[PDB]
Ligand binder design. Structure first.
Ligand SMILES: O=C1C[C@@H](C(=O)O)NC(=O)N1
Ligand SMILES: O=C1C[C@@H](C(=O)O)NC(=O)N1
Ligand SMILES: [Zn+2]
Ligand SMILES: [Zn+2]
Ligand SMILES: [Zn+2]
Ligand SMILES: [Zn+2]
Ligand SMILES: [Zn+2]
Ligand SMILES: [Zn+2]
Ligand SMILES: [Zn+2]
Ligand SMILES: [Zn+2]
Lengths: 362, 362
């Protein structure tokens, strides 16, 4: 007997197009999403060229409309030069992404004053998300308070960070956060097996105590999101390993395993992969869209999942219980039992739907 | 210039049918909802007969399908006799309502053990809401913890209650709450004008300090809901005044006024009247549904709003800014400028929609 879930939303994916299409492209990354029970993705802007201006967003929108198999929204990226220039296109994006730690030269911000400038100029009704680790979480929260608005913290990975966010929420501050599956299901204990190249990710894998703190503080976690960050095995195993794990195809099976073990409820999962993504990012419903999962099927994660061009996975060897059997997207069968059945270009930019515009005062 | 909002949801209304139809019926109460920018309502079970068993729910479902002009879900009510008997119909209801303070003899629970029995027997994946004032909030929270599940607290009205809920949330407990507009916009200062009969409501109007505490603790409030509780003026002004205020037609104008004054943002409002109701009660999206509001129009609330059969309002004389201009429900114009344009029976039971069933493990 299958369980029907609504269309799940991953608010943090790197689909690598334009400019890194050997790692992933819209077509392969959204095939991976559908196979993971995800029907809508928000794609990050650290592409080549990065999505830091209107022409780059226009290009990315067309590449996504032509290649995506599930629905999507595209983030804009903050740069040292673009504060105050994005107002005409801001509402067409998923939100604004700030990279506040290590990143591409083009997305590097060298001063907290540049963070303030973005918080002051980006339209106040639209989402801002930040890659902000350790004390950077507290720093960006301060900027958000100085500018009197909300912030969403990407991939919280540490006891330190979740407790800081917990304390901020206890003070009524408008902050939300997400956690990625690798920070719930992998730790330092796995670095021996992964090795130093494959194991490179940012935020880095935490201690057992970090992992346990995230689980204990599930109530503080608003969303799950994969931070699907595909790189090829050659890259991960080479001399300058880029950080990141692929994760679209493994996220939901890992979390369904946890549900089956009573570590969180089905509702807890659906708040974090459906309702809270919708409400934080003002993402629209998808009509006639659902995911059918089999919660009894036990399997072992293989050395690579079928669809991501990353062609490797750090979860290899983990035993999971739960599998995606069928996905229906806007009335069409999109995935059954290992076969994607919608072509590149079936997916649409949800920010162009009437119901996908973020409401604002006139 | 109008602002387009999504279809708003009121999770706490009393529509009086069956058995109190001089006060309101499905057709008049849902006309009032549409005129208030509400496209989906959850109707409480304290009707005559009360919705405490499968035959009463079946009757109410047909009366609602024939009379409702907007979409709806119907609550079941807990009684001293029905724990363990509702499992076959539970999933068809909005949730289970517990009346833990004053109420009808049929909904009266005389022992906390009866509360426990309901929390133990009602399906664990389905909503439970409680009318729980003052220390009763803490008592029902204890029952929820003993039975390891969530609870939603209706119409929080006091500093004491919002601070208790705040403390529970800080401990990661699964509790949500709603606040009604009369507890944000009226206080003891208004009892002279209202008089002792009109002013009767449960929870009673709070002090200025209660009202200020609710505003200061907006972050703790998950939903707004009217507790639309229509009674005629003859009843409110008579010898045994029943408690309650009509509120569907005034809720959104009062809250839009507050948005225009910067007391909360448009997003804060939409989280509380759309996203959080959806996610707490697992209510489905409504396709091609939206509300157009005019935020500049200043008007004074009259002695009665056009649609509720209550034919009075405690907000008479308050100056508001914001008005509902047009409502579209599932592709049809449902309301324009004082005229309801969908007939009784246009509305549907959202729990019968495939997307409106609450997900559960097999
Ligand atoms: O911050 C980031 C970005 C990402 C990428 O590869 O794009 N991979 C990571 O591990 N962390
Ligand atoms: O608890 C309740 C119920 C309600 C009603 O009239 O049905 N009116 C109130 O004022 N409080
Ligand atoms: Zn990141
Ligand atoms: Zn993120
Ligand atoms: Zn990322
Ligand atoms: Zn929204
Ligand atoms: Zn009540
Ligand atoms: Zn309620
Ligand atoms: Zn009520
Ligand atoms: Zn739901």
């Amino acid at each position: 007997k299958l369980v029907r879930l609504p269309g799940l939303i991953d608010v943090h994916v790197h689909l690598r197009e334009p400019g890194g299409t050997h790692k992933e492209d819209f077509a392969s990354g959204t095939a991976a999403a559908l196979a993971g029970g995800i029907t809508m993705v928000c794609a990050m802007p650290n592409t080549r060229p990065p999505i830091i201006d209107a022409p780059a967003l226009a290009l990315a929108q067309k590449l996504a409309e032509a290649g995506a198999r599930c629905d999507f929204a595209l983030f804009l990226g903050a740069s040292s030069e673009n504060a105050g220039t994005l107002g005409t296109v801001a509402g067409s994006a998923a939100g604004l992404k700030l990279y506040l730690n290590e990143t591409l030269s083009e997305l590097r911000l060298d001063s907290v004053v540049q963070w303030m400038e973005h918080f002051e100029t980006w339209p106040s009704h639209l989402p801002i998300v930040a890659h902000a680790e350790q004390q950077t979480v507290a720093a960006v929260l301060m900027v958000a308070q100085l500018t009197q608005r909300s912030v969403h913290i990407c991939h919280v990975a540490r006891k330190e960070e979740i407790l800081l966010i917990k304390a901020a929420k206890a003070r009524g501050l408008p902050v939300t956060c997400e956690v990625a599956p690798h920070h719930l299901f992998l730790s330092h204990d796995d670095l021996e097996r992964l090795g130093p190249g494959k194991g490179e990710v940012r935020p880095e894998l935490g201690s057992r105590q970090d992992v346990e703190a995230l689980w204990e503080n599930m109530a503080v976690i608003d969303c799950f999101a994969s931070d699907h960050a595909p790189h090829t095995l050659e890259e991960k195993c080479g001399s300058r390993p880029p950080p990141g794990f692929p994760g679209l195809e493994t996220m939901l099976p890992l979390l369904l395993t946890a549900v089956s073990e009573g570590r969180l409820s089905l509702d807890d999962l659906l708040q974090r992969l459906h309702h809270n993504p919708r409400r934080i990012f003002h993402l629209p419903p998808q009509e006639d869209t659902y995911v059918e999962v089999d919660l009894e099927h036990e399997w072992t994660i293989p050395s690579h999942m079928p669809f991501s061009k990353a062609h490797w996975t750090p979860f290899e060897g983990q035993k999971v219980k739960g599998t995606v059997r069928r996905v229906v997207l806007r009335g069409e069968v999109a995935y059954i039992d290992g076969q994607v059945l919608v072509p590149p270009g079936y997916g649409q930019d949800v920010r162009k739907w009437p119901q996908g515009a973020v409401p604002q005062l006139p």
